[PDB]
Design an enzyme around this catalytic site. Structure first.
Site, mmCIF file in Angstrom:
data_model
loop_
_atom_site.group_PDB
_atom_site.id
_atom_site.type_symbol
_atom_site.label_atom_id
_atom_site.label_comp_id
_atom_site.label_asym_id
_atom_site.label_seq_id
_atom_site.Cartn_x
_atom_site.Cartn_y
_atom_site.Cartn_z
ATOM 1 N N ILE B 101 76.822 100.946 12.616
ATOM 2 C CA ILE B 101 76.041 101.437 13.744
ATOM 3 C C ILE B 101 75.873 100.299 14.738
ATOM 4 O O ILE B 101 75.357 99.232 14.392
ATOM 5 C CB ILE B 101 74.678 101.973 13.285
ATOM 6 C CG1 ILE B 101 74.873 103.104 12.283
ATOM 7 C CG2 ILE B 101 73.874 102.455 14.477
ATOM 8 C CD1 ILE B 101 75.619 104.274 12.849
ATOM 9 N N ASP B 268 70.450 102.082 7.207
ATOM 10 C CA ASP B 268 69.721 102.616 6.059
ATOM 11 C C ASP B 268 69.344 104.078 6.249
ATOM 12 O O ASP B 268 69.192 104.807 5.263
ATOM 13 C CB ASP B 268 68.460 101.794 5.774
ATOM 14 C CG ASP B 268 68.765 100.405 5.238
ATOM 15 O OD1 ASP B 268 69.118 100.293 4.046
ATOM 16 O OD2 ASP B 268 68.612 99.421 5.988
ATOM 17 N N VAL B 270 71.110 106.308 8.548
ATOM 18 C CA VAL B 270 72.307 107.126 8.713
ATOM 19 C C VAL B 270 73.054 107.268 7.395
ATOM 20 O O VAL B 270 73.716 108.282 7.169
ATOM 21 C CB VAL B 270 73.223 106.573 9.821
ATOM 22 C CG1 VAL B 270 72.477 106.487 11.140
ATOM 23 C CG2 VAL B 270 73.795 105.233 9.430
ATOM 24 N N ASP B 286 80.522 94.897 2.611
ATOM 25 C CA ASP B 286 80.635 93.712 1.771
ATOM 26 C C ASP B 286 81.071 94.041 0.348
ATOM 27 O O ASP B 286 81.645 93.178 -0.324
ATOM 28 C CB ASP B 286 79.308 92.947 1.754
ATOM 29 C CG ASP B 286 78.131 93.817 1.349
ATOM 30 O OD1 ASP B 286 78.154 94.385 0.238
ATOM 31 O OD2 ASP B 286 77.175 93.925 2.144
ATOM 32 N N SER B 516 75.794 87.458 3.189
ATOM 33 C CA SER B 516 74.706 88.246 3.753
ATOM 34 C C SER B 516 73.411 88.128 2.963
ATOM 35 O O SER B 516 72.356 88.511 3.479
ATOM 36 C CB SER B 516 75.111 89.718 3.842
ATOM 37 O OG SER B 516 75.285 90.275 2.552
ATOM 38 N N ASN B 550 68.074 51.233 5.488
ATOM 39 C CA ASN B 550 68.425 51.015 4.088
ATOM 40 C C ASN B 550 67.816 49.731 3.529
ATOM 41 O O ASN B 550 68.467 48.990 2.790
ATOM 42 C CB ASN B 550 69.942 51.002 3.916
ATOM 43 C CG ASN B 550 70.616 49.936 4.762
ATOM 44 O OD1 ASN B 550 70.000 49.351 5.652
ATOM 45 N ND2 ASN B 550 71.890 49.681 4.485
ATOM 46 N N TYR B 578 51.623 64.712 -18.836
ATOM 47 C CA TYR B 578 52.983 64.498 -18.370
ATOM 48 C C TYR B 578 53.171 63.037 -17.999
ATOM 49 O O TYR B 578 52.225 62.352 -17.599
ATOM 50 C CB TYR B 578 53.322 65.397 -17.172
ATOM 51 C CG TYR B 578 52.492 65.133 -15.935
ATOM 52 C CD1 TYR B 578 52.902 64.207 -14.986
ATOM 53 C CD2 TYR B 578 51.302 65.812 -15.714
ATOM 54 C CE1 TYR B 578 52.152 63.962 -13.857
ATOM 55 C CE2 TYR B 578 50.544 65.573 -14.585
ATOM 56 C CZ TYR B 578 50.973 64.647 -13.660
ATOM 57 O OH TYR B 578 50.222 64.404 -12.534
ATOM 58 N N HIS B 654 66.446 61.755 1.045
ATOM 59 C CA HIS B 654 66.712 62.535 2.250
ATOM 60 C C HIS B 654 67.956 63.382 2.017
ATOM 61 O O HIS B 654 69.062 62.845 1.897
ATOM 62 C CB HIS B 654 66.896 61.629 3.464
ATOM 63 C CG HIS B 654 65.648 60.919 3.880
ATOM 64 N ND1 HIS B 654 64.422 61.172 3.305
ATOM 65 C CD2 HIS B 654 65.435 59.965 4.816
ATOM 66 C CE1 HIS B 654 63.508 60.403 3.868
ATOM 67 N NE2 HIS B 654 64.096 59.661 4.788
ATOM 68 N N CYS B 699 63.319 65.810 2.950
ATOM 69 C CA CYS B 699 63.657 66.685 4.061
ATOM 70 C C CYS B 699 64.894 67.511 3.738
ATOM 71 O O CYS B 699 65.764 67.096 2.968
ATOM 72 C CB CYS B 699 63.892 65.867 5.330
ATOM 73 S SG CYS B 699 65.195 64.627 5.178
#
Ligand SMILES: [Zn+2]
Lengths: 346, 1095
Positions: B101, B268, B270, B286, B516, B550, B578, B654, B699
């Site tokens: 669609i 969904d 149609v 897919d 997807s 560094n 722990y 990082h 990050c």
């Protein structure tokens, strides 16, 4: 009977943890003056392996038995409140299963209420493990009378998930709502009421088992406090403060644990032992509050015991503490007078 | 198949007279019993009328004795609705439904459809499309691009900041999308009330040309190219076809087709309309045809590759060796061992043409009452559907979509009709939604709250709740339970398997499906914003762009002991059992400070093995109860952390600035796996924990919720499991959890959480804090499923974050943009909290307390099951009730069991034949429990059954379990029990095995009748109790409970009881009665008188 068992419960609660070893019953017999049964005071009473004490309550009875380790614990118990039957065994842990009373001759209408209170758990609360409420498919209202502050231990109340036809099941707690916090471990809800009643750090836990497994159960329970009512579990989770419920002491072990720096003992029911108990043919004391081993001098109900710094066991003969000399009998109680140590009569 | 109208009055007997609701129930049940299998829809509707008859009766009469039996009948109905839809087996309409669609069909999609067309040549291909929906994708791309430019130029002075929350940019961009969409809908409404009617493409052309600098000829060329491609690829139109019948469905379809641009929901809806009008099978592009099960019957399984990635390997090898789909990138297959590749070569080249390399089933046995749906992550997914013409359950799916869109429109149209800014209309929409809130649909309104944001802002997922898998799951719950319009009630996975798409017909783990599966969440939003700001102006504008250096700074222990520990405000309040190896892997101050702070969170139970410099790693822990730093060798412990049960590794570094980053701290998954292997070898000599946990922090290190096996934490865990389970003993595979935080969060002196940004210092991006803390779950291997699941988040922690959002929104010193960002974050948090309840994703406690409870439930379920098939056996072969079954003697006799039934009035034994082996297993378990109870009773005196008390716990729990089992059997009452009397059978067996010899040797019927009569008469208390409520003292002598026996001997004075007490036990009881004393005195006097005589 009811009066003698009430006095026994008062004696047990007023004890300083000396409530489960076999010598505890000798102390009780001295307190009740059982030597007057024969007529002379020098009678040594033997608390053997299969010693049983049955105490009748206004609702039911509780039977304690002595173990192979000369320890006294609840063997059985049953009390009925005309709407809920509470039963404790020894093979299911020391758990009080509270279930709606199944009325015979089912032709009559079946009740929907299922109440619980801490009143029958007076004195024996130190032997209970947990309270498992098991509503049937007919149970619609669950009354949790949490307003009973004259106890010492408040077992966790586990409300089993009912596969019921009722659209909503009401858990009515006879308490306010600002006291309670909530938490979750796994798929269980947890409501913790913490309060300071007469300088007592009262902490009552009510978990609902498997209530977060599906929305069929999550939206089924409705919480009813004394100030605010008809609260859904989502309302509790979005309006009440949340705490972290997982703790190391709530795991399952069978022996001695060294958690942090404190030693605890988990008995056959994988629950913490509390007080002065016999383990491995030795006598140990666990704090009647934190349930951890204590070493050194302990004044249990006025009687002085010494527990080894290293192994934690109670001294049961002539001992040397900081160079000084002390004498203890086979029960670990410190003794006064002239007694024979290895050096002579000191 | 349900019980008849009779046998129910014998069941629901009550003191109340038969009510009219009960009469309605009986009439509905008998009218269902008299019915024909034809027209299953009405066969279904009769059950869907009887069910609510029963529900109305129960709700009206809660305190009703009948409600017991009818609850079991409803359960029987729940097991009978499954039987219906299992009768029909008609072949599915030979159509394959594809939907595109809006826009043009991609050549990848056409190549994917080519496999279905060629392999399944019996089915014709239906690529659904619309005549006037071709430029919607172009309009959406144009509006998002223009709004991206507008938002970037609006926040141009701010986006230059390396630490800038992209959620503000997304807020501005959404304001612009909503403005442009409002402009488009105003234009559409103005141009739709015209003479004749323009095509939707015409309005889109006009809007794009007038505002977006577009050329009409380009749009026309795109339209005709798409039309030609779709038609040549089996295109079927919707507007030029009878598909849009109901006006409401057209309204909700155009609701996302043009109002929102959400072509996903258009697909969904149609797909459901196509599967209702015609029949057949719908498949997303897919999906790919399944492979034959036996084609790869061999086991090249590496056991180091995830089961899903094994299917990925299968498909990738299949379409790499024999190229079927163009550009099938083999980034996953072309890294395995060469022998495996050679084996795959042999298998693929040893087969016939494409018709046998892929499976193709024409045996799709479905009913007109049923639809089928694919499965993903243990939940329904409408990526593959099978349904005939006008399927009733499909109609339920359309009804569910219609109800959900009815609620959404009812609460949204008042908000969107009033011309307001995006923020204002969203505020109005949320206010209406939460004012119309209800306990039943709280999660539904939570999910559909960001409806205007679906597809454009991160973490906005409402299509799943309106027209996606949520609607199908609700329809399945409606079908199974015969309910209607249910919103959030979910179905258990055990009852959901019957509707599953045939597993052989689908290869779900496809490259396009995996591509997807990447949701538009915070992780993907970060890189989308990064791409936007790379395409605008210039420069990396990355967090690592800030003085990433560094250096090799060693630990400033004075800094740790004087600024880190003293200023710590974070409270753990957890377990603290722990050892926390804080293995910092990068020397920059960005990681260094995070290392120091995370040490400061719990300095005593944590050690730093910072790897900034290679050959100097040393455990920089805290002195025992001191204020000094003690430095052992690499990965060593203070030797006071020996009893710790958990190892919390927290590698600091990082990650690469890529979505689904492949390298963390400049080391890939294999290099970091080797580093963790060296870690495990080094710590094997120190600690042997029970639960290992890795806590990767840095990050670009998110905790992705989808495609877990393709993630850095997922692949890392998939690598280090052999090393964990071998080097560290007593650590099973499911105890290893890996998380991925992105920010180091601390609590300052004022109680405000702050993050260590890459620009240094501790910025207070509150939205970033709460999003990062919300978006983190622990990937862990599931040995029971061989899959990488995600651990339940800290639901109390998530609620704490939500409450923080609540209180901080209450504050007036917060920006409106931040206000609505945090409102959306709170919405997502409570949606996740609701998801952990809706998706059945929370595990049980699993301890001694719960195991006894759970085992009791399992025993009850098996009890009900066995009663069910024994009712089935007592229905056929006549033999209904009054022929109590004898479980003691069951003979297999060569794979055809011969079981014995015993009549009540006479000892009639009939050895009926059954094929099910469940009877033998249940009989074995019953005999074992009865044997345990019998061994708990060493002797019985005059039938008093003296208990042998055991003081050890094992025997106590065994006896209690046996007693619970036998007492549950004895006191059984059920709908099936009246015609079965299983309770009576077990009671008779227990009485026979205890009071007499075993039931195996009681063939003598004359005394068997007496045994039946006596067993039913009295109640045997097998529960462990010293005193059965009698107010007497208890005398337990070295095991034997004798108090009750002695009391009854001394009260009743039973000569037998005395005899067996003297013989079996060895007990003599002194009768202190005056009568016995007088008799003995007279006896002695007479003896003295007679003996002294000498005669
Ligand atoms: Zn970085």
């Amino acid at each position: 009977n009811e009066s003698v068992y009430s006095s026994y419960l008062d004696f047990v609660k007023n004890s300083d943890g000396h409530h489960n070893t076999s010598n505890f019953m000798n102390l009780f017999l001295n307190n009740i003056s059982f030597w007057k049964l024969f007529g002379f005071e020098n009678i040594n009473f033997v608390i053997d392996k299969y010693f049983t004490l049955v105490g009748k309550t206004n609702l039911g009875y509780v039977e304690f038995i002595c173990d192979n380790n000369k320890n006294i614990d609840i063997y059985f118990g049953e009390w009925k409140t005309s709407s809920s039957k509470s039963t404790i065994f020894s093979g299911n842990g020391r758990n009080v299963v509270v279930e709606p009373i199944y009325n015979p001759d089912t032709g009559e209408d079946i009740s929907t209420s299922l109440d619980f209170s801490y009143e029958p758990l007076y004195g024996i609360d130190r032997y209970i493990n947990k309270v498992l409420i098991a509503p049937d498919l007919y149970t619609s209202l669950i009354n949790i009378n949490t307003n009973y502050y004259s106890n010492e231990y408040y077992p966790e109340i586990i409300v089993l998930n009912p596969n019921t036809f009722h659209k909503k099941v009401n858990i009515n707690l006879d308490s306010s709502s600002f006291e309670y916090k909530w938490s979750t471990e796994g798929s269980d809800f947890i409501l913790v009421r913490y309060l300071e009643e007469s300088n007592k750090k009262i902490l009552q836990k009510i978990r609902i088992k498997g209530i977060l497994s599906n929305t069929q159960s999550f939206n089924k329970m409705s919480i009813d406090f004394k100030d605010i009512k008809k609260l859904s579990l989502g309302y509790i989770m979005s309006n009440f403060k949340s705490f972290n419920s997982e703790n190391e002491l709530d795991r399952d072990h069978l022996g001695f644990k060294i958690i942090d720096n404190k030693t605890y003992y988990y008995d056959e029911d994988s629950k913490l032992v509390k007080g002065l108990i016999n383990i491995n043919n030795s006598l140990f004391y666990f704090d009647p509050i934190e349930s951890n081993l204590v070493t050194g001098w302990q004044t249990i109900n006025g009687k002085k015991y010494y527990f080894d710094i290293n192994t934690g066991a109670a001294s049961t003969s002539y001992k040397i503490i900081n160079g000084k000399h002390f004498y203890f009998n086979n029960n670990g109680v410190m003794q006064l007078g002239v007694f024979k140590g290895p050096d002579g009569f000191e | 198949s349900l019980i008849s109208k009779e046998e129910l009055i014998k069941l629901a007997y009550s003191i109340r007279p038969r009510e009219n609701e009960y009469k309605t129930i009986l009439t509905n049940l008998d009218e269902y019993n008299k019915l024909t299998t034809n027209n299953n829809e009405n066969k279904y509707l009769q059950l869907k009328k009887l069910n609510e008859s029963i529900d109305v009766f129960m709700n009206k009469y809660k305190n009703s004795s009948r409600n017991r039996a009818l609850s079991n009948l409803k359960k029987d109905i729940l097991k009978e609705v499954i039987l219906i839809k299992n009768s029909n087996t008609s072949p599915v309409e030979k159509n394959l439904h594809f939907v595109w669609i809006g826009g043009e069909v991609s050549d990848i999609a056409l190549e994917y459809i080519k496999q279905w067309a060629d392999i399944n040549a019996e089915y014709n291909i239906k690529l659904w499309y619309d005549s006037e929906a071709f430029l919607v994708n172009t309009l959406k791309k144009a509006i998002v691009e223009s709004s991206t430019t507008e938002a970037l130029q609006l926040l141009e002075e701010e986006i230059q900041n390396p630490q800038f929350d992209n959620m503000k940019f997304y807020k501005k961009r959404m304001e612009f999308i909503y403005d442009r969409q409002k402009r488009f809908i105003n234009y559409y409404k103005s141009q739709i009330n015209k003479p004749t009617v323009p095509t939707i493409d015409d309005i889109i052309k006009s809007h794009l040309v007038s505002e977006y600098n577009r050329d009409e000829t380009l749009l026309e060329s795109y339209r005709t190219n798409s039309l030609r491609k779709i038609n040549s690829n089996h295109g079927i139109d919707i507007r030029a076809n009878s598909l849009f019948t109901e006006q409401e469905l057209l309204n909700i379809y155009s609701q996302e087709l043009l109002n929102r641009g959400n072509l996903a929901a258009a697909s969904d809806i149609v797909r459901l309309l196509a599967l209702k009008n015609f029949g057949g099978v719908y498949l997303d592009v897919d999906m790919l045809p399944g492979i034959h099960s036996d084609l790869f019957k061999t086991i090249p399984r590496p056991s180091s590759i995830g089961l899903d990635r094994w299917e990925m390997i299968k498909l990738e090898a299949i379409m790499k060796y024999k190229k079927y789909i163009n550009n099938y990138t083999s980034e996953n297959f072309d890294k395995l061992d060469q022998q495996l590749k050679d084996n795959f070569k042999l298998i693929i080249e040893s087969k016939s043409e494409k018709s046998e390399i892929f499976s193709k089933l024409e045996n799709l046995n479905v009913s007109d009452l049923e639809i089928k749906i694919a499965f993903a992550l243990g939940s329904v997914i409408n990526q593959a559907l099978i349904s005939k013409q006008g399927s009733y359950l499909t109609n339920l799916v359309i009804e569910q979509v219609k109800n959900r869109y009815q609620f959404l429109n009812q609460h949204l149209n008042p908000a969107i009709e009033s011309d307001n800014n995006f923020t204002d209309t969203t505020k109005i929409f949320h206010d209406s939604l939460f004012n119309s809130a209800t306990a039943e649909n709280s999660m539904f309104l939570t999910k559909i709250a960001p409806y205007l944001q679906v597809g454009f802002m991160p973490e906005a997922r409402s299509t799943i709740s309106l027209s996606g898998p949520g609607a199908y799951a609700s329809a399945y719950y409606d079908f199974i339970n015969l309910q209607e319009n249910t919103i959030e009630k979910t179905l258990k996975a055990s009852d959901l398997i019957e509707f599953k798409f045939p597993e052989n017909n689908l290869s779900q783990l496809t490259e396009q499906e995996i591509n997807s599966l990447w949701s538009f969440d915070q992780a993907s939003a970060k890189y989308q914003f990064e791409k936007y700001v790379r395409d605008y102006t210039g420069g990396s504008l990355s967090e690592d762009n800030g003085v990433d250096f560094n250096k090799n700074t060693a630990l400033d222990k004075n800094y740790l002991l004087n600024n880190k520990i003293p200023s710590n405000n974070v409270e753990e309040a957890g377990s603290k059992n722990y050892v926390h190896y804080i293995i910092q892997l990068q020397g920059d101050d960005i990681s260094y400070e995070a290392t120091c702070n995370l040490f400061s969170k719990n300095p005593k139970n944590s050690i730093i093995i910072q790897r900034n410099m290679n050959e100097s790693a040393k455990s920089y822990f805290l002195s025992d109860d001191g204020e000094s730093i003690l430095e052992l060798n690499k990965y060593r412990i203070p030797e006071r952390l020996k009893n710790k049960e958990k190892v919390k590794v927290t590698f600091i570094g990082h990650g690469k600035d890529e979505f689904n980053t492949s390298e963390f701290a400049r080391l890939s998954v294999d290099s970091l796996s080797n580093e963790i292997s060296s870690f495990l070898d080094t710590i094997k000599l120190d600690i042997s924990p029970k639960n290992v946990e890795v806590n990767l922090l840095g990050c670009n290190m998110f905790s992705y919720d989808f495609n877990v096996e393709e993630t850095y934490p997922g692949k890392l865990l998939l690598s280090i499991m052999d090393k964990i389970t071998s080097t560290l003993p007593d650590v099973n595979k499911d105890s290893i959890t890996i998380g991925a935080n992105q920010y180091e969060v601390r609590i300052n002196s004022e109680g405000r959480k702050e993050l260590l940004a890459h620009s240094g210092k501790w910025i207070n991006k509150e939205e970033a804090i709460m999003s990062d803390l919300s978006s983190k779950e622990y990937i862990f291997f599931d040995s029971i499923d061989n899959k990488l699941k995600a651990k339940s988040k800290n639901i109390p922690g998530l609620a704490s974050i939500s409450e923080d959002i609540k209180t901080l929104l209450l504050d007036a010193s917060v920006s409106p943009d931040t206000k609505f960002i945090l409102n959306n974050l709170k919405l997502n948090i409570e949606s996740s909290i609701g998801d952990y309840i809706y998706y059945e994703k929370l595990e049980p406690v699993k301890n001694i307390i719960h195991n006894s409870i759970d085992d009791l439930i399992d025993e009850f379920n098996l009890l009900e099951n066995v009663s069910d098939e024994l009712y089935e056996l007592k229905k056929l072969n006549n033999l209904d009730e009054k022929y109590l079954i004898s479980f003691e003697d069951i003979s297999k006799n060569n794979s055809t069991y011969s079981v014995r039934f015993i009549n009540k009035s006479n000892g009639e034994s009939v050895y009926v034949e059954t094929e099910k082996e469940i009877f033998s297993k249940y009989s074995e378990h019953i005999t074992k429990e009865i044997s345990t109870i019998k061994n708990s009773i060493i002797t019985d005196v005059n039938g008093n059954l003296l208990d042998n008390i055991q003081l050890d716990h094992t025997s106590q729990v065994n006896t209690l379990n046996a007693a619970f089992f036998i007492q549950s059997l004895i006191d059984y009452s059920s709908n099936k029990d009246v015609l079965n009397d299983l309770s009576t059978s077990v009671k008779v067996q227990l009485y026979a095995q205890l009071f007499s010899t075993g039931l195996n040797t009681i063939y003598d019927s004359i005394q068997l009748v007496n045994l039946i009569s006596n067993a039913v008469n009295d109640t045997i208390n097998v529960l462990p109790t010293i005193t059965e409520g009698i107010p007497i003292v208890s005398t337990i002598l070295d095991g034997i409970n004798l108090g009750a026996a002695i009391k009854e001997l001394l009260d009743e004075h039973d000569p037998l009881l005395k005899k067996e007490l003297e013989a079996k036990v060895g007990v003599l009881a002194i009768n202190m009665s005056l009568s016995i004393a007088a008799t003995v005195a007279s006896i002695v006097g007479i003896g003295a008188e007679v003996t002294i005589f000498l005669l």
